[PDB]
């Protein structure tokens, strides 16, 4: 399809979280170079250009465990902007998609961050329960499950806004999660 918008969903030198393929686990990354779907070389156009869907934009990203492998290109559906703004109980709204630390693999250690749709909120002076639809790896969705804690929860930022969340000049974010798998 013909399109004028050269700008992708995320900007260059942005901190972004990329989701995995075989388990679906969110590993954090840093994009150095963004490549949007081919844009028209001027054909029946005048004004008004729109963002492109999440299939055809490649982000050259460096994985937290794989900076030695340089960068790898990822389709826009496999990446979402790294959570900076954490939305607490005070600004909590039903339907917002957030990530939370869930250790399904070994409940002793920090597992992986998975995305979850916030379904319910119960905040009283005596009890604070937060419920959401947890996406399981075995192709299952556990609706109204107990959300771990707000400091394990980060609010996943929107792509359609065309995010300009840039890392400091010559300084990518050193701060990370605890993510990985190592056998005794």
From Swiss-Prot:
Post-translational modification: Phosphorylation at Ser-182 of the linker region decreases the binding to H3K9me3. Ubiquitinated; which leads to proteasomal degradation. Autoubiquitinated; interaction with USP7 leads to deubiquitination and prevents degradation. Polyubiquitination may be stimulated by DNA damage.
Induction: Up-regulated in proliferating cells, and down-regulated in quiescent or differentiated cells. Early induced by E1A in postmitotic cells. Down-regulated by aphidicolin.
Modified residues (Phosphoserine): 40, 182
Renumbered residue ranges of the record's region Tudor-like 1: 8-84
Localisation: Nucleus
Region span, Tudor-like 2: 91-159
Phenotypic consequence of gene deletion: Mice display a sensitization to DNA damage and replication block, and die in mid-gestation.
Expressing tissues: Expressed in thymus, testis, spleen and lung. Within testis, expressed in almost all cells except elongated spermatids.
UniProt subunit comment: Interacts with DNMT3A and DNMT3B. Interacts with DNMT1; the interaction is direct. Interacts with USP7; leading to its deubiquitination. Interacts with HDAC1, but not with HDAC2. Interacts with BLTP3A. Interacts with PML. Interacts with EHMT2. Binds hemimethylated CpG containing oligonucleotides. Interacts with PRAMEL7. Interacts with ZNF263; recruited to the SIX3 promoter along with other proteins involved in chromatin modification and transcriptional corepression where it contributes to transcriptional repression. Interacts with UHRF2. Interacts with FANCD2.
UniProt free text on domains: The tudor-like regions specifically recognize and bind histone H3 unmethylated at 'Arg-2' (H3R2me0), while the PHD-type zinc finger specifically recognizes and binds histone H3 trimethylated at 'Lys-9' (H3K9me3). The tudor-like regions simultaneously recognizes H3K9me3 through a conserved aromatic cage in the first tudor-like subdomain and unmodified H3K4 (H3K4me0) within a groove between the tandem subdomains.
Identification of the protein by name: E3 ubiquitin-protein ligase UHRF1
Source organism of this protein record: Mus musculus (Mouse)
Lineage: Eukaryota, Metazoa, Chordata, Craniata, Vertebrata
Gene: Uhrf1
